[PDB]
Design a protein around this ligand. Structure first.
Ligand code: HEM
Ligand SMILES: *[C@@H]1O[C@H](CO)[C@@H](O[C@@H]2O[C@H](CO)[C@@H](O)[C@H](O)[C@H]2NC(C)=O)[C@H](O)[C@H]1NC(C)=O
Ligand SMILES: *[C@@H]1O[C@H](CO)[C@@H](O)[C@H](O)[C@H]1NC(C)=O
Ligand SMILES: *[C@@H]1O[C@H](CO)[C@@H](O)[C@H](O)[C@H]1NC(C)=O
Ligand SMILES: [Ca+2]
Ligand SMILES: [Zn+2]
Length: 595
């Protein structure tokens, strides 16, 4: 045999079998294989990697090297010809609120992060990749096709750096390149608490013995907490407005400030931790700071699991929910809890749910000021519009009262993401998330569309007419065949997202299978699953059943009118109720009596 386990990075396996709490790293969840689902290990491979050279070079790397006898098309050409649209009229989801998109991003950030390799530390190819567009080592530029308007305004390419991989990064390894998942595979609120001990400690308030998370000491939201600032430079949140000079937030996850509504959701979760810790200190004044932090952390982890599996997944997977995620039957320590490489592209279905604008609404759910509605691209790495423009409440009202974009075969990804994406150290609102996703599919050695159809027990179309039948769309099938020449070569991100959505769902059959399998494993493979007997008491579980995003908003903002079903498209005032009528989380079952 060859390398049975290349785990030289993070070899520290020091497990307490008795602990009623998760580790921060995710180590020690599975007793027989304690690294399973831990952060900073390889993404799982459900199918073998597919590289040009068998090992590490992406398809599209070598101009002369075909995939199955055809050249792979430029990611940006696919983006332009298939993914782009002009007309935002009629593109909204009539039955999903903007919170539906935003929770997807939150769950995805809890589960997976494959950060770009660190070879740009005092290196030219940081700006040289950008400046000269020369492919090599970790520089894998997204080249513009001849007719691209960006060729006219932005030079020859968009910079792109290859993802980090296991058995460290600049030299070779044991057969095929395996990308890293930097966060815990468990649905465990690692995006609030961190997946590394250093960060996890930095986020905590170790001054008081109250188990609190650190809060901003420079700004308040009408007396409610902000995340602390990340005081490190250069800051993209300062870069986008050097007058306001408001830094990015420091959260459990590196990406928290990528856009204003993600920063908003991270703010609600932090507030909820501190709220729970204060309630628990009342019930149990004898609990020290560590106990308070762990108990509140464990409740917030359960909150995220319940909203996700009870409220979110059913309205993503539709008819496919029951097929892939049956009712819970307890912890199965034979299940692989690791996030798969392909899942990290499957869950980018959210890219097609992001609409072109964000609104701030007032207490009557009416436009907040004269520029209430803003273009999404102005809100990438934007914290100043929170600190200096009315705090999170107006944005939270927009998350409730405004709609997700609907996935449309003729209108896939808004130009706000497809032409105006901002990336840190890049200085322009000029990147293309769709092109980045296609390039990253290839970076990660993804098997093509038909390999995944076969994995999912679905038909593998070989001809234009077969692709038309699967996509229920003759013009989309023709564009994909003109670019890819065979459905075997269609990148998984675009192939999965091209399929028409399942009934009562928001993804097609291929994505429902890949997502459904992953979420089944996330639940069944987790020793700390909230509903696993022993994790919580039966009385605690009865209290936890009553959690809602609506109550989270009521408890952690000055919003007093909320819908009961926050993921549905809700209109004010008909679909909104007073917070008074909304079930609370009853923490009385956490009262701990020794005497
Ligand atoms: C305005 C909203 C959003 C922005 C600005 C955004 C931006 C990005 C960026 C820049 C990446 C990295 C691309 C790469 O380097 O390969 C990414 C990755 C990703 N996005 Fe989004 N995204 C948004 C919404 C969402 C939503 C709604 C979902 C899910 C429902 C989602 C799921 C993901 C996933 C799973 C990844 C891969 C994470 C990893 O393993 O590294 N995104 N996003
Ligand atoms: C950068 O941030 C500043 C600081 O908020 C923005 O200025 C505000 O700008 C408008 C003028 O268009 C005023 O009506 C507001 O009342 C200002 N507030 C303050 C405190 O100055 C500015 O618009 C931002 N610029 C960019 C390009 O984002
Ligand atoms: C820590 O909590 C104490 C106790 O309330 C508070 O006064 C202090 O501001 C907190 N510090 C941070 C950084 O949150
Ligand atoms: C536990 O997981 C294994 C591997 O997926 C599977 O064979 C078995 O059916 C599972 N156990 C139960 C009780 O479902
Ligand atoms: Ca996690
Ligand atoms: Zn207020």
């Amino acid at each position: 045999s060859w390398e049975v386990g290349c785990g030289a990075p993070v070899p520290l396996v020091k497990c307490d079998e008795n602990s009623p709490y998760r580790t921060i790293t995710g180590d020690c969840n599975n007793r027989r294989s304690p690294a399973l689902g831990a952060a900073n290990r390889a993404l799982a491979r459900w199918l073998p990697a597919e590289y040009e050279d068998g090992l590490a070079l992406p398809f599209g790397w070598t101009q002369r090297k075909t995939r199955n006898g055809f050249r792979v098309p430029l990611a940006r050409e696919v983006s332009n010809k298939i993914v782009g649209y002009l007309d935002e009229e009629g593109v909204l989801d009539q039955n999903r609120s903007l919170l539906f998109m935003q929770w997807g991003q939150i769950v995805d950030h809890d589960l997976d992060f494959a950060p770009e390799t660190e070879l740009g530390s005092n290196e030219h190819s940081k700006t040289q990749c950008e400046e000269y567009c020369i492919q090599g080592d970790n520089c894998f530029p997204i080249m513009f096709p001849k007719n691209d308007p960006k060729l006219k305004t932005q030079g020859k390419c968009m910079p792109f750096f290859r993802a980090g991989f296991v058995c460290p990064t600049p030299p070779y390894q044991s057969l095929a390149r395996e990308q890293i998942n930097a966060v815990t595979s468990f649905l465990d609120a690692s995006l609030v608490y961190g997946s590394e001990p250093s960060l996890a400690s930095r986020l905590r308030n170790l001054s008081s013995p109250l188990g609190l998370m650190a809060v901003n000491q420079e700004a308040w939201d009408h007396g409610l907490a902000y995340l602390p600032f990340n005081n490190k430079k250069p800051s993209p949140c300062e870069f986008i407005n050097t007058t306001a000079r408001v830094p990015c937030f420091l959260a459990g996850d590196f990406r928290a400030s990528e856009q204003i509504l993600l920063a908003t959701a991270h703010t609600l979760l932090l507030r909820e931790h501190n709220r729970l810790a204060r309630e628990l200190k009342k019930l149990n004044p004898h609990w020290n700071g560590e106990k308070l932090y762990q108990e509140a952390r464990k409740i917030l982890g359960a909150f995220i699991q319940i909203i996700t599996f009870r409220d979110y997944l059913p309205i993503v997977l539709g008819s496919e929910m029951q097929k892939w995620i049956p009712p819970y039957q307890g912890y199965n320590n034979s299940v692989d809890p690791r996030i798969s490489n392909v899942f990290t592209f499957a869950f980018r279905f959210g890219h097609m749910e992001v609409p072109s604008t964000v609104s701030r609404l007032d207490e009557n759910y009416q436009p907040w000021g004269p520029e209430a509605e803003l273009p999404l691209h102005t809100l990438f790495f934007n914290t100043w519009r929170i600190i200096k423009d009315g705090g999170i409440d107006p944005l939270v009202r927009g998350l409730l009262a405004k709609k997700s974009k609907l996935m449309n075969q003729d209108k896939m990804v808004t130009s706000e993401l497809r032409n105006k994406l901002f990336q840190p150290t890049h200085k322009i609102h000029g990147f293309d998330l769709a092109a980045i996703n296609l390039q990253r599919c290839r970076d990660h050695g993804m098997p093509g569309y038909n390999s995944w159809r076969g994995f999912c027990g679905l038909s593998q179309p070989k001809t234009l007419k077969g692709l038309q039948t699967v996509l229920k769309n003759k013009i989309l099938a023709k564009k994909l065949m003109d670019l890819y020449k065979t459905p075997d070569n269609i990148d998984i991100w675009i192939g999965g997202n091209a399929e028409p959505m399942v009934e009562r769902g928001r993804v097609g059959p291929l994505l429902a299978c890949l997502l459904g399998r992953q979420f089944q494993q996330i639940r069944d493979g987790d020793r700390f699953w909230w509903e696993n007997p022993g994790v919580f008491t039966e009385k605690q579980r009865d209290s936890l059943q009553k959690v809602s995003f609506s109550r989270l908003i009521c408890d952690n903002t000055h919003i007093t009118k909320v819908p009961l079903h926050a993921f549905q498209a809700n209109n004010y005032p008909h679909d909104f109720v007073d917070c008074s009528t909304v079930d609370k989380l009853d923490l009385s079952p956490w009262a701990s009596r020794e005497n």
